[PDB]
Design a protein around this ligand. Structure first.
Ligand SMILES: CCCc1nccc(N)n1
Length: 330
């Protein structure tokens, strides 16, 4: 089998991407944030505290003839941005882009933190990291990808995120029309439950490439590119008037600037992030200070290749017995 679904930015800045997902019988379509940095499929629901729902579409398990309570199971998650959610668990039929999994764990939120409430466009998360990170207790549950894998034509999914435009998540096949040149594959460590890999280095604009190992994660659920402070300082030093602001919480730059590109290494290959991808717009409405898309990881404990980086590539998440990542230009 295969599946193919369009992913759409939630706003003019590409803060996140939503993909429609069919849950239950008859189908209930929710728009989920596909997240290769976490491993829970959780939804706004008929169980969510009413004051914490503000415009999201909810899953109502009592209206699904295939929903079953997973007795005794609970979940609770906290994300790198400090957001959180928790609840109980159903199994139900879940389809993405024509690919169906029966008996998927659908984690129903009883509580969500204010960032989730305040974002009417995201109805929940669909985790695509390794199932070892799944938070369901006392019986850990499998991701949608892990449940689909055996049925797929090839044990892979691909992320093709757009810049200010829709893109695609494919399951079970590699669309050879979706990228230019060849796909460079690189080793993955699953030891922390992430798609963790080592970039071979970077360049700033037309500058010379610096060969240096940068360990980090391929994370579709993170907006920005978080790298070591040395690398980030080298980038922003090329932008007149850029500075790190403790009050704003990162590097800011004059909105009048033209940003340089940023290149990262994948083996001997190179992915170029255009400068425009690094502009996250005014820090507050009408400000002439703009927020940068490349920020320091120093306060995180891991480097994160988030959407700023991944949207410059066609990315293969190879779930073979020994997982690997692939990157192509597009
Ligand atoms: C705007 C980024 C997407 C998002 N929305 C709500 C909560 C969260 N952690 N991320």
């Amino acid at each position: 089998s295969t599946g193919s679904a369009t992913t759409t930015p939630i706003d003019s800045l590409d803060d996140a991407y939503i993909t429609p997902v069919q849950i239950g019988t008859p189908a209930q379509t929710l728009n989920l944030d596909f997240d290769t940095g976490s491993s829970d499929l959780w939804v706004f629901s008929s169980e969510t505290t009413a004051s914490e729902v503000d415009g999201q579409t909810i899953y109502t398990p009592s209206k699904s003839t295939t929903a079953k309570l997973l007795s005794g199971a609970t979940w609770s998650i906290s994300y790198g941005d400090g957001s959180s959610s928790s609840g109980d668990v159903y199994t139900d039929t879940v389809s993405v882009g024509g690919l169906t999994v029966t008996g998927q764990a659908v984690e129903s939120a009883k509580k969500v933190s204010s960032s989730f409430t305040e974002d009417s466009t995201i109805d929940g998360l669909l985790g695509l990291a390794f199932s070892t990170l799944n938070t369901v207790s006392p019986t850990q549950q499998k991701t949608f990808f892990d449940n689909a894998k055996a049925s797929l034509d090839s044990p892979v999914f691909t992320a093709d995120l757009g810049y200010h435009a829709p893109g695609t998540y494919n399951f079970g096949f590699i669309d050879t029309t979706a990228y230019t040149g060849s796909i460079t594959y690189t080793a993955v460590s699953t030891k922390q439950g992430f798609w963790e890999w080592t970039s071979t280095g970077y360049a700033v604009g037309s500058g010379t490439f610096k060969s240096t190992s940068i360990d980090g994660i391929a994370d579709t659920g993170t907006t920005l590119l978080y790298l070591p402070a040395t690398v980030v300082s080298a980038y922003w030093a090329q932008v007149s008037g850029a500075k790190s602001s403790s009050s704003v919480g990162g590097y800011v730059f004059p909105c009048s600037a033209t940003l340089p590109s940023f290149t990262f290494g994948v083996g001997s290959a190179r992915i170029v992030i255009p400068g425009d991808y690094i502009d996250f717009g005014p820090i507050s409405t009408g400000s002439s200070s703009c927020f940068g898309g490349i920020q320091s990881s120093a306060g995180i404990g891991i480097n994160i290749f988030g959407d700023v980086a991944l949207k410059a590539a066609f990315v293969v998440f190879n779930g073979a017995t020994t997982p690997t990542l692939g990157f192509a230009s597009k």
